[PDB]
Amino acid sequence: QLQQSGPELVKPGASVKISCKASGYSFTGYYMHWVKQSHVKSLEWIGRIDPYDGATSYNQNFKDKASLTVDKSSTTGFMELHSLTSEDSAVYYCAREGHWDGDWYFDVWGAGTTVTVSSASTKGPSVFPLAPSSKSTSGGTAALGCLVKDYFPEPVTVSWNSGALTSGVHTFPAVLQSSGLYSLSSVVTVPSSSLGTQTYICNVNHKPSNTKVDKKVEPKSC
Amino acid sequence: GDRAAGQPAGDR
Amino acid sequence: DIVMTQTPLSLSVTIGQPASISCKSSQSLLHSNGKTYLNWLQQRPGQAPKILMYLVSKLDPGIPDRFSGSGSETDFTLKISRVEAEDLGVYYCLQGTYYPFTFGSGTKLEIKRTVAAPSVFIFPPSDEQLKSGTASVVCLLNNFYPREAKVQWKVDNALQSGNSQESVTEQDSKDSTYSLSSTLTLSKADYEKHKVYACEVTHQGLSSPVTKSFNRGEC
């Protein structure tokens, strides 16, 4: 019921504007809050906005940083951040304060928007196939995958067969390389007998660089 | 509730 | 603003066994209207936070009855009757009495399951990457528990160090196991200097170290 914008790469000092598309409920009837997540243990409330008249209530820490606007025509809420620093790199959620049993709480959350603040420029990833072989077989099951290397910033989206292959898929958290570029891998376990009939394609989408790559992972003699 | 309401931590 | 303290920081509970998370506030969260605005959130890895309970004890209609919440004005407790595999993730408490909203530090909950030995796979570097001038050899550990595992690379029976990186997945929401990848990165020159590449795996569920190896040129 809440759709957010894609990940953003911002240079230090610039500004960013992220959107929160609402659907399926009375837009002007519930507050829309925004939350910053710097890391796993850091969760902070930014502010709220009344979509009916545009009344905005902010947290004192984000007075000069964030500003909440609304668009009743598209039923979309926006948050703009001004003069970004390194400490502004975080994930930003929008949430609805819903009603149930005569009480209010956040019952709908957006997926979150990743904002990376860096002077470095975006770099597209390189996709290499992790081809299955006799060395990647265990009990009639085979392993294959895709190595996504040398991209910046996070995140990169990996899917298999346009999202049709999900069972047994493990996409690893990215690692920081000495070059400052990230790298990760996505793997899936399949029946080794089905390597000749089935087609396995990994779909890598790096939105900050607008890089969509499809790689067919075929077996190899090894 | 046509107008939005919420927990008292939202507004001062 | 009100400071929320969550104890413990990390917690590991077996399936079907009870769990308990604590949250303490600096001031009494009782409001002038008599309501105590305390909220419990759960964030599974790779997902957005979701509120489990509001006003200390009221459950969200989508949340099962095994979750319960009991607390006074300053101290609060979130209890799970029988922990299931889907109950993993980080739990935050959130006060809504005094402006502004403030969250807790968070409590990581690990699901304790029976010991599972990892499946070891190895992937020789792709020819497309070799044309670029680099060589990444991946060693894969799949569906093991617990997450404590040790991987060591051997190039021609010579132990390596300083040229590999490893990454562990989050705990699976279904089987409560982990997976681990270990990537050995070298130059095209350094890779062609040797022939035998292997990764040795040691885990609690294994009696002796497991060795997946390959020879450059088998492909």
Author numbering:
A (entry chain A): 3 to 52, 52A, 53 to 82, 82A, 82B, 82C, 83 to 100, 100A, ...
B (entry chain P): 1 to 12
C (entry chain B): 1 to 27, 27A, 27B, 27C, 27D, 27E, 28 to 214
Extract from the study:
Circumsporozoite protein (CSP) is the most abundant protein on the surface of all Plasmodium sporozoites and is necessary for parasite development and infection. CSP contains an unusual central region consisting of multiple, short amino acid repeats whose sequence depends on the Plasmodium species. The PvCSP central region is composed of nonapeptides GDRA(A/D)GQPA and ANGAGNQPG characteristic of strains VK210 and VK247, respectively. The central region of CSP is immunodominant, and antibodies targeting the repeats can inhibit sporozoite infection.
